Amino acid sequence: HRPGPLKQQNKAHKGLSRVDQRHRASQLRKQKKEAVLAEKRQLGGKDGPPHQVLVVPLHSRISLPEAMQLLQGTVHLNELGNTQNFMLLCPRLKHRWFFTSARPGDLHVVLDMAKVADTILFLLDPLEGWDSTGDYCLSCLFAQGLPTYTLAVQGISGLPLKKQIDTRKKLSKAVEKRFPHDKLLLLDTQQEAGMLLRQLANQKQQHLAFRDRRAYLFAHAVDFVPSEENNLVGTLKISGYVRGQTLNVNRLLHIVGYGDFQMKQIDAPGDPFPLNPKVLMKADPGRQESLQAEVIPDPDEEAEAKMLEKYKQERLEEMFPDEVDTPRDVAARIRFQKYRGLKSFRTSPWDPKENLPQDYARIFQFQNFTNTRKSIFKEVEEKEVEGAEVGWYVTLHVSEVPVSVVECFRQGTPLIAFSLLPHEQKMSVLNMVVRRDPGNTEPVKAKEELIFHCGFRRFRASPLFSQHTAADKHKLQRFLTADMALVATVYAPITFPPASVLLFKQKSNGMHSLIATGHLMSVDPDRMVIKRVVLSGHPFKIFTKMAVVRYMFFNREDVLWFKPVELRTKWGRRGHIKEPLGTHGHMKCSFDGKLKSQDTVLMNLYKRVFPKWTYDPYVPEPVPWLKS
RNA sequence: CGGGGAAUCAGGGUUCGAUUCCGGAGAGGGAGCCUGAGAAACGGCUACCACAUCCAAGGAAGGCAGCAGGCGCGCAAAUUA
RNA sequence: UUAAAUCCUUUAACGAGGAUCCAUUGGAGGGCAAGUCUGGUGCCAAUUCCAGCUCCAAUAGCGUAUAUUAAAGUUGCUGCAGUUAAAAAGCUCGUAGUUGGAUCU
RNA sequence: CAAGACGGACCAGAGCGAAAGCAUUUGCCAAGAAUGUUUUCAUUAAUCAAGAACGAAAGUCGGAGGUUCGAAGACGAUCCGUCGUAGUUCCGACCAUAAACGAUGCCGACCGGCGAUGCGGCGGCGUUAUUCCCAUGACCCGCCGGGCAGCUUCCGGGAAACCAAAGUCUUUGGGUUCCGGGGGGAGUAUGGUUGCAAAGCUGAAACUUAAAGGAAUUGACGGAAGGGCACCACCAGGAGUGGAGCCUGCGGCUUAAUUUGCACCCGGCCCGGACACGGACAGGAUUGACAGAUUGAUAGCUCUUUCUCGAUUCCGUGGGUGGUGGUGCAUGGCCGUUUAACAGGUCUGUGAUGCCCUGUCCGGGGCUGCACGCGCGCUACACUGACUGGCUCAGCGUGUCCUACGCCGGCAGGCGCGGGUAACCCGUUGAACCCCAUUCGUGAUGGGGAUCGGGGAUUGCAAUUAUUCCCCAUGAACGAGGAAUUCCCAGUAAGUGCGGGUCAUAAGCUUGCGUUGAUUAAGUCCCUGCCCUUUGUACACACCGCCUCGCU
């Protein structure tokens, strides 16, 4: 209310020096330049590991051995059954290299020798940028994480000179889609080889969080001491350079293709290839050595028919969101017994600890995941554990391995190990957000097996797909929709984020088809999947704010068991179940407004869903990938 | 760095000019010279300071704010034709 | 052409119907140009998020950020104000600086 | 008698001062504006950075004095009171700040009217100084100058309040000084400087925000206030229901219904489409029926037994219409009514006209049955009385059911004979209260009458759950009625009887009528209800302030 003129309201009474700046700049610049000089001096030099360079030809038209001749200063040519990986020492530029090669389509080979490489040298043909296979390996490499890379074109000087300049111009477009701001170097003669080696030697290094937070190692030499040959299990001796952090023997060691192992000793023999031309220092004892306790120690044409059926199921679940027909034989209070109805999907609460299954008795939990992650990261960043640290060529005595791993190194498969962080070997629930790659559009059922690449770890498992929303509960997606990003929930060993998430489908011919890509969101079992089931029916008698609906049920007590569930329609109004007619599922509903004859009455049933125990740590080696 | 100059422009003004023309200054920071008509010259020498190269450990050699090219810096800039 | 070339210019031959030999970038349903539109997704018919259609502008270009200038008479010499809106000093004597009546054919 | 303080009323529309400020007489001192001027000097001026004088109150340092008042403080109440410290007073040093205001630099020019006021000057009749013996003072008239302050004004200006400056401003320049640049941060930090101190002067940035602010006109608005009217409001009263019994109405409780704002209930009849499709049908579809029975009763309208009529047919399923349906509009004739007119209308006609659907008679019961709350009435709760007997007074009306008269029966009531279609007969309307006389005697009693048993008569087809009356046998509650209020000012309330309407018979509702006849008042808005005027002041809304904790 506004006061009148008779209301008494009084009018308010209104009542450094330039030399010093230059000196400061000099001091800060000296600090930054000395720190950067130390960081650049570590890699490739006499106080660090060799600079590891993985060479990948992105086209089938590239002759890899002649390029390897060009890159090869003294060469120590180590080789395997099919691959040749050679060390290169050059005191002219004072730099040490380990040059490895990998053909695209060998998924484990390229992914492993790129997840230890410091540099990736891509090779291109002058005509096109890359084939479909090179595109596939580039998609996988972008998914896993790229270190420093360098682009080189191989046969530009084989073309006539009249086109050569224009060719490079054209190939710039063929590069600008995926490598937008990157120069193209040439590999024709020894002189360009020296220039390329110089570009690789002095270059800014991309640093990757997953492999620098954990100590890792690429095994240069591997041999075996079997305890019993009939047992096919014995002590393994793997020699390579310490790469990421200080290697402490009291932590578990993961081999990327064979899982976790306990390691007993770290010895430091002489460096076989030092830059400028038997002693053991550590011990085993199990007073703090972690144990391998992943589980709680306390106790023809039918395939095409199935594929078309899955296509039709994806179409139906796309066009009907969650509609499932009521069974005419089984009682709805029995088939849907473990279901409840929610007035509110978003705001109505749900107990995270209600009705936990047996499998959650086999996993671990965090009282606070964020505080634990900060504590372990602060410990691994600030403290300095008394172990073999970065630079020395060490040899690992690891306790028990299967023998076949040794045989793997005899064909040419790289052997890469890394020390786990604490709490990594323990199983839990991993929720990891994924998005679908456009190259593949085959249907993906939610509870089918898939191959997961998560943070140096490969395993076969069955996830659950749910929506990535901002609510406390997330509805189940039974098909991986190829437009948005969903969340896969799985039983998996604990991996502390960040880490890359690659999903693959095992095809019939042995190839892995890429499906997903992304980051591990969190590791917590308190996330829940909510299966949402629609029952629908016809309001066959419509009156003023009161309707008679059929085709919901077929018994009479099925209405009574599901009475307190409110109803909704496709056209917007809600409704409440008043009372059944009898014996046939006909039932009177109370509605806030009038219903159309073409309207359909619906209700939802909710059930809390948890993943399945499908964790297989063995991933078979694919055949080389090819475009179909 | 200064000027000729650029942008806007009713008129007055305002903002910019490191930058190919003119003048000045410096050649990692200071200093002292030799020769020469002319230099306090650095693609000349001599020291100190700061960095840094080869070495047989005795010694020797250094100056891209020239053209390319690299690292670093960064929001930010091209071929060792 | 030129040192030798490239490009342009000049000319043989081939080279256009979905002439697929396919123009983008932004904005619009409060105000300057441009909407009585649709479909999913949640809260108690209103209502968060997402994909679109239709329209509009400039066009081989069009957004964005930052600085600055013009709009701006919000720095005012031209050309602002100072009762009640930001603002005139407690008051007067109180040197420099600024301004200084009329008059000589 | 003394000490310190302060100069009211006169005292303003005043005056003076640079401002702060300035009110007892007298004397002294040194200044000052305006006025007057045919004096002098002759540009000597205007405005302020620097620097300097003064600067209310409170405050600080030395003294003196301490009446009143009085921060603090001690007490007593719960913004006040008693006592009173520093102070308030004077002198000498500091401090230099105020809403230190016209919230409005200073100097100069130009630009409306008016009649008042303060000082000076000029001109002028008159009245006064107990006619004043000339001037002088006080008044009176007019003018000039510098003031303080008003009223007025399409000078113009302003966003408006308003301004003779806040004008002469986009048609933008008289001179000069200080000073603002959205709101906060913030007059804060920092440095300098002044001060004995309290503090004074100078004075940011980071950051943060989309506003901040000025002026004016306004509907509605629970309400609020002034009045007025009213016994459906009040004061003083009268009669009281509400206290008891009976009766009646809303709910509530039972019930088959106790209908409802003969409508109800229990049983038996009667009839109740065509269209399409599929069935039965002359071997016979279907109609009529003697007789007996079921039934509260009979009845071919039913349950048996077959006589006859023969196409006049009869069974089922449809979300398909619908017709002996209800309803409105345009529509042509026809009454009575005030050429004309039908808001009174009427009448078998027209639109494949819009819409919504596809009960009769008979018998019985019930129509408040009753624990109750919700309201009107009758009777009495006794001595101003009850019983009995005697005496003596009306009116409004009504009547082919009002009745006179005679006989009988103790009475309700029967029989016969006349009057009345009405100021004619009932009827001189022989009424009841009231009066007189007897008995009763303060006693749930000769008060009061309910509820009961028997008998008789009347009204009706029928009186059972008593239609109604009469007589006898019983005398329950009822002791003047606690907190809502109903009606009322003269032949009125109240007491008391008598008629009309409803009625084959009630007595219970409403209307009136007459008889005896009271208390209080000629007032009021205290309450209630209604009608006015003012207002959006009061409360509320609104302003602003005050607006959760716990580890890493």
Swiss-Prot record:
<comment type="function">
    <text>Required during maturation of the 40S ribosomal subunit in the nucleolus.</text>
</comment>
<dbReference type="InterPro" id="IPR039761">
    <property type="entry name" value="Bms1/Tsr1"/>
</dbReference>
<dbReference type="GO" id="GO:0005525">
    <property type="term" value="F:GTP binding"/>
</dbReference>
<comment type="similarity">
    <text>Belongs to the TRAFAC class translation factor GTPase superfamily. Bms1-like GTPase family. TSR1 subfamily.</text>
</comment>
<dbReference type="InterPro" id="IPR007034">
    <property type="entry name" value="BMS1_TSR1_C"/>
</dbReference>
<dbReference type="GO" id="GO:0003924">
    <property type="term" value="F:GTPase activity"/>
</dbReference>
<protein>
    <recommendedName>
        <fullName>Pre-rRNA-processing protein TSR1 homolog</fullName>
    </recommendedName>
</protein>
<dbReference type="InterPro" id="IPR030387">
    <property type="entry name" value="G_Bms1/Tsr1_dom"/>
</dbReference>
<dbReference type="GO" id="GO:0000462">
    <property type="term" value="P:maturation of SSU-rRNA from tricistronic rRNA transcript (SSU-rRNA, 5.8S rRNA, LSU-rRNA)"/>
</dbReference>
<dbReference type="GO" id="GO:0000479">
    <property type="term" value="P:endonucleolytic cleavage of tricistronic rRNA transcript (SSU-rRNA, 5.8S rRNA, LSU-rRNA)"/>
</dbReference>
<dbReference type="GO" id="GO:0003723">
    <property type="term" value="F:RNA binding"/>
</dbReference>
<dbReference type="Pfam" id="PF22298">
    <property type="entry name" value="Tsr1_G-like"/>
</dbReference>
<keyword id="KW-0690">Ribosome biogenesis</keyword>
<dbReference type="GO" id="GO:0005730">
    <property type="term" value="C:nucleolus"/>
</dbReference>
<dbReference type="GO" id="GO:0034511">
    <property type="term" value="F:U3 snoRNA binding"/>
</dbReference>
<dbReference type="InterPro" id="IPR012948">
    <property type="entry name" value="AARP2CN"/>
</dbReference>
<keyword id="KW-0539">Nucleus</keyword>
<dbReference type="GO" id="GO:0005654">
    <property type="term" value="C:nucleoplasm"/>
</dbReference>
<dbReference type="GO" id="GO:0005829">
    <property type="term" value="C:cytosol"/>
</dbReference>
<feature type="domain" description="Bms1-type G">
    <location>
        <begin position="49"/>
        <end position="206"/>
    </location>
</feature>
<dbReference type="Pfam" id="PF04950">
    <property type="entry name" value="RIBIOP_C"/>
</dbReference>
<feature type="compositionally biased region" description="Basic and acidic residues">
    <location>
        <begin position="16"/>
        <end position="23"/>
    </location>
</feature>
<dbReference type="Pfam" id="PF08142">
    <property type="entry name" value="AARP2CN"/>
</dbReference>
